Amino acid sequence: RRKSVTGEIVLITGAGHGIGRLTAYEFAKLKSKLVLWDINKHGLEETAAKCKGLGAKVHTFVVDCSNREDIYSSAKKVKAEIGDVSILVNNAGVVYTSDLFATQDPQIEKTFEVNVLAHFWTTKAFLPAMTKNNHGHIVTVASAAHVSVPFLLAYCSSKFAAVGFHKTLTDELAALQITGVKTTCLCPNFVNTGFIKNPSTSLGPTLEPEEVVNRLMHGILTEQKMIFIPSSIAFLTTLERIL
Amino acid sequence: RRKSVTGEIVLITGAGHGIGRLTAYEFAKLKSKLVLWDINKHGLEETAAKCKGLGAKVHTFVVDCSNREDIYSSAKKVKAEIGDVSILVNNAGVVYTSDLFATQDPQIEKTFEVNVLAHFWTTKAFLPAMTKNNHGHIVTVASAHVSVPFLLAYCSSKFAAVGFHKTLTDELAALQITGVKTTCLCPNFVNTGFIKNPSTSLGPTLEPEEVVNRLMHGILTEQKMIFIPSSIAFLTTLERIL
Ligand SMILES: C[C@]12CC[C@@H](O)C[C@@H]1CC[C@@H]1[C@@H]2CC[C@]2(C)C(=O)CC[C@@H]12
Ligand SMILES: C[C@]12CC[C@@H](O)C[C@@H]1CC[C@@H]1[C@@H]2CC[C@]2(C)C(=O)CC[C@@H]12
Ligand SMILES: [Cl-]
Ligand SMILES: [Cl-]
Ligand SMILES: [Cl-]
Numbered sequence: 001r002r003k004s005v006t007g008e009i010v011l012i013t014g015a016g017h018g019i020g021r022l023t024a025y026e027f028a029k030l031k032s033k034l035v036l037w038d039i040n041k042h043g044l045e046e047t048a049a050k051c052k053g054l055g056a057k058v059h060t061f062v063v064d065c066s067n068r069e070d071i072y073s074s075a076k077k078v079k080a081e082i083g084d085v086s087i088l089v090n091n092a093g094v095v096y097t098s099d100l101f102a103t104q105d106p107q108i109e110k111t112f113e114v115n116v117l118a119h120f121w122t123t124k125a126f127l128p129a130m131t132k133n134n135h136g137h138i139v140t141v142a143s144a145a146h147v148s149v150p151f152l153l154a155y156c157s158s159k160f161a162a163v164g165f166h167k168t169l170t171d172e173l174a175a176l177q178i179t180g181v182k183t184t185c186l187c188p189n190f191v192n193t194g195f196i197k198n199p200s201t202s203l204g205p206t207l208e209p210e211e212v213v214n215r216l217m218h219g220i221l222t223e224q225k226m227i228f229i230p231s232s233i234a235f236l237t238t239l240e241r242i243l
Numbered sequence: 244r245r246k247s248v249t250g251e252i253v254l255i256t257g258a259g260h261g262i263g264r265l266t267a268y269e270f271a272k273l274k275s276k277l278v279l280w281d282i283n284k285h286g287l288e289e290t291a292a293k294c295k296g297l298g299a300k301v302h303t304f305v306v307d308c309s310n311r312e313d314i315y316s317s318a319k320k321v322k323a324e325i326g327d328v329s330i331l332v333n334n335a336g337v338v339y340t341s342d343l344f345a346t347q348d349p350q351i352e353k354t355f356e357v358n359v360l361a362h363f364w365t366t367k368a369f370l371p372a373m374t375k376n377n378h379g380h381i382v383t384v385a386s387a388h389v390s391v392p393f394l395l396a397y398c399s400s401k402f403a404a405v406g407f408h409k410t411l412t413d414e415l416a417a418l419q420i421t422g423v424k425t426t427c428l429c430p431n432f433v434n435t436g437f438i439k440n441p442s443t444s445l446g447p448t449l450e451p452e453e454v455v456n457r458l459m460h461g462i463l464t465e466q467k468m469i470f471i472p473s474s475i476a477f478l479t480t481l482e483r484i485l
């Protein structure tokens with residue numbers, strides 16, 4: 001059923017908090033070699049210490065995944081110091097600050113920089129060696145756990161985009177007969193249902209972070225292409241806060 | 244079955260060429276008041292001249308839809324000089340330079356800037372007045388060959404634009420804004436993917452005039468989705484590099 005990932009170099013972005021953190025713990029338990037990236041040094045170090053306790057070799061890099069040059073310079077260090085990434089988990093997400101009208105547009109831009117464009121940059125960095133070895137796994141994490149109304153459109157759109165990235169990349173790999181590089185996407189149901197047609201997008205039930213990761217890991221280890229989960233976007237209540 | 248759009252202020256981006264131009268002509272015949280945006284002054288003036296020949300009031304603006312400030316500056320002019328746009332056609336698309344002659348990454352960024360983020364900026368500029376009046380129509384044109392280096396960006400951007408449409412549609416519904424409609428011209432691949440749908444590699448496809456016929460009919464009947472076959476020749480594009 002489930003593949004071994006022992007000794008595989010697994011790189012997880014956004015590993016200092018949330019799903020990314022919990023995902024790192026699961027790979028640690030499986031004795032992968034971990035490369036953890038996060039913008040927040042403190043969260044990153046906490047994740048890494050626990051992963052070591054779980055029995056894994058772990059390396060950390062503070063990386064701002066809104067910054068393409070930071071991603072590439074850090075990827076260069078990974079390749080030189082650690083080796084070739086075999087499982088890439090694109091998990092980093094934008095974190096919103098102010099709601100205020102005047103400062104929204106840069107954060108709408110950042111939403112796409114982190115949630116979508118970062119996946120291009122990491123794939124460009126790490127897919128060539130995977131292709132060369134015909135061995136790899138690219139994991140598009142397009143679910144994250146509440147977003148204020150001004151960012152709802154950007155946030156949701158960016159998830160459709162990430163799912164599109166996965167679907168297109170999957171078929172490109174197939175077209176090119178790159179049979180050893182697998183893809184897995186963690187996808188919110190709203191990408192299939194929309195919001196109004198699916199009351200769960202407003203009412204739940206939703207999943208605990210532990211449940212999301214259990215489902216993600218099961219999908220990765222059985223090499224499922226798609227893993228649908230209910231989001232916790234709280235659509236109607238998010239929108240009623242203006243009405 | 245079809246609404247009249249007589250005297251509606253219809254803004255079309257990418258109106259200096261291709262289906263934007265052909266769409267401008269159809270709105271011209273229906274006696275809309277046209278606002279045409281494009282990065283090319285001559286293409287723009289050519290489209291305008293024919294729209295005027297077809298009997299319509301027409302105004303033009305040279306606008307780089309990759310540039311948020313330019314969009315907002317131009318929108319301010321439209322509001323002041325012409326009035327409140329009632330039909331917004333988000334049609335501008337990225338144009339690529341071969342990676343033989345340019346770096347890839349700025350063009351991947353530009354793909355999202357034009358094909359997705361521009362729709363945010365035009366919507367933020369024009370939707371408020373539409374909502375105030377409870378009258379408007381936002382048209383997401385997410386159908387437009389692309390080389391292998393840009394195929395992933397190009398395709399992903401169309402999924403994104405369809406996601407924009409679907410989310411916006413539901414926000415408006417949730418807020419009970421009944422008079423602002425949405426229409427999306429969507430490639431079939433967003434529902435089927437590529438390998439599962441041989442037409443994405445083999446066709447048959449539509450001629451531009453057919454695409455525009457279907458677009459106009461959907462707009463005028465206020466259809467939310469209009470699926471069309473794309474012409475990206477997926478497998479042959481990729482297998483070329485093998
Ligand atoms: C597989 C292939 C194309 C075949 C071989 O040269 C390896 C490269 C690795 C990077 C891939 C590229 C295809 C196009 C991809 C998928 C992109 O658009 C970003 C990363 C790119
Ligand atoms: C138009 C085209 C080729 C079509 C499109 O990819 C844009 C580029 C822009 C640079 C041009 C190139 C044709 C060949 C040229 C003229 C060169 O040899 C140097 C610059 C090159
Ligand atoms: Cl991060
Ligand atoms: Cl980040
Ligand atoms: Cl959902």
Ligand SMILES: [Cl-]
Pocket residue numbers: 260261262263387
């Ligand atoms: Cl076109």
Ligand SMILES: [Cl-]
Pocket residue numbers: 345346347348
């Ligand atoms: Cl390049």
Ligand SMILES: [Cl-]
Pocket residue numbers: 430431432433442443471472473474
């Ligand atoms: Cl298609």
